[PDB]
Structure 1
Amino acid sequence: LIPRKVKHRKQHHPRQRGIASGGTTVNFGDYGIQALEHAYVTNRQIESARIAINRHIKRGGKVWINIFPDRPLTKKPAETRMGSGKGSPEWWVANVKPGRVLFELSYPNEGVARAALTRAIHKLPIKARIITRE
């Protein structure tokens, strides 16, 4: 995942403070992964947690990703003193506040879908949990 344009190539770090206010409930699917703590979730971490939900159900189902990495982070070159400018962009971060639902899932069986979302919490740099549509 990567955007096709951004208006500003070099941005500040998005601030990691506050309980989330939007996307706090499961809207598309029946099961979902809710965050519990602040972290930057990069596009490599989403595509790794996506292919761990897909390759455990192996057919059927539908997987929603209502989180997109559109905020860039920058990186200096390797052996460099401080302060000759700001570095070129390297990573792509989606700011994840506590309470935010990351992945969602509709699947007919309960124990397979719940044991597939656990295999994506172990790929993400947060503490998380599985919540249901009531």
Structure 2
Amino acid sequence: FKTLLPVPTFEDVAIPEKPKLRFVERVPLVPKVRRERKNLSDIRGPSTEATEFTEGRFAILALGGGYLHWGHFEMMRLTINRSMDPKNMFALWRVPAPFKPITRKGMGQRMGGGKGAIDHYVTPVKAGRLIVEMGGRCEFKEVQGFLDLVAHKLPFPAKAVSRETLEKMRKDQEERERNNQNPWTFERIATANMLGIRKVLSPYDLTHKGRYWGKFYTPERV
């Protein structure tokens, strides 16, 4: 004998038309003629934009920073589109089409001579940004199962999350940092310039607080 439990029911879910992901273009329609310098600073540190959910209850969350080029968009589009029930689920791009020109030279060039030519386009993705947002009358578990594939084939480390999962790990993140037993935290030492440590740190560190190092992000770092 086992007693039953009430099943979660979705009466409030409204499925939009064209639930499957839009095709995105290899190159923008108005190709950038002027060659841009590479901010690596756009992959660096925490993300400001696209941190929260909008319509959907599920998402892929980026744990590192990285560049997304057309190959990745293709991968996600196909993989998600044939992995979903178009009736019961819908997906959404939380990331723009690749807009940032990246140059190259022909292999075999000597150093110098000018900048290179535009090879392809990418999208910058800062750690903590939602890549793809899936809603529906789905339970998190199915979506999670096939979303983790996609997540795994992305250039940065990433996870599949729900609203519940995300707020879980955020409350855990702050609770870990008010639980902390040792008096010595990165913030505390860095801001007050103890041991003259500011010599070895970068200015950005004051904001990043030793959680972010380069494009990498370690969540365990308080």
- Aligned-partner SS, 1:95: strand
- Aligned-partner SS, 1:25: coil
Kindly indicate whether the alpha-carbon contact (under 8 Å) linking 2:152 and 2:158 is maintained by their aligned counterparts in 1.
Answer: no
What's the % identity of the aligned pairs?
31
Partner of 1:27: 54
Partner of 1:4: 29
Measured after TM superposition, the shift of residue 7 of structure 1 is 5.0
In our comparison, the structure showing a higher alpha carbon Rg is: 2
* Separation of aligned partners in 2, 1:76 and 1:65: 32
Q: Does 1:53 align with 2:80?
A: yes
Partner of 1:131: 161
Work out the number of aligned pairs and report it.
134
Kindly indicate whether the alpha-carbon contact (under 8 Å) linking 1:50 and 1:120 is maintained by their aligned counterparts in 2.
Answer: no
Partner of 2:124: 95
Cα gap change, 1:3 to 1:116, in 2 (>3 Å): same
Measured after TM superposition, the shift of residue 78 of structure 1 is 2.1
Kindly indicate whether the alpha-carbon contact (under 8 Å) linking 1:32 and 1:131 is maintained by their aligned counterparts in 2.
Answer: yes
- Aligned with 1:67 (options 95, 102, 109): 95
Q: Does 1:109 align with 2:134?
A: no
Measured after TM superposition, the shift of residue 32 of structure 1 is 0.3
* Separation of aligned partners in 2, 1:103 and 1:66: 5
Kindly indicate whether the alpha-carbon contact (under 8 Å) linking 2:103 and 2:117 is maintained by their aligned counterparts in 1.
Answer: yes
Q: Does 1:44 align with 2:71?
A: yes
Measured after TM superposition, the shift of residue 58 of structure 1 is 5.0
Q: 1:79 corresponds to which letter in structure 2?
A: G
TM-score after normalising by structure 2: 0.56
TM-score after normalising by structure 1: 0.89
Structure (1/2) with the larger strand percentage: 1
- Aligned-partner SS, 1:74: strand
Q: Deviations over 1:47-106 (max 9, x none)?
A: 112211111115332211121211110110122111111111112111110111101111
Report the RMSD for the aligned CA atoms in angstroms: 1.7
Following superposition, which runs of at least 4 residues in structure 1 exceed 6 angstroms of deviation?
Answer: none
Unaligned 5+ segments in structure 1 are none
Higher RCO structure (Cα 8 Å, ≥6 apart)? 1
Kindly indicate whether the alpha-carbon contact (under 8 Å) linking 1:35 and 1:100 is maintained by their aligned counterparts in 2.
Answer: yes
Partner of 1:82: 111
Structure (1/2) with the larger helix percentage: 2
Kindly indicate whether the alpha-carbon contact (under 8 Å) linking 1:72 and 1:93 is maintained by their aligned counterparts in 2.
Answer: yes
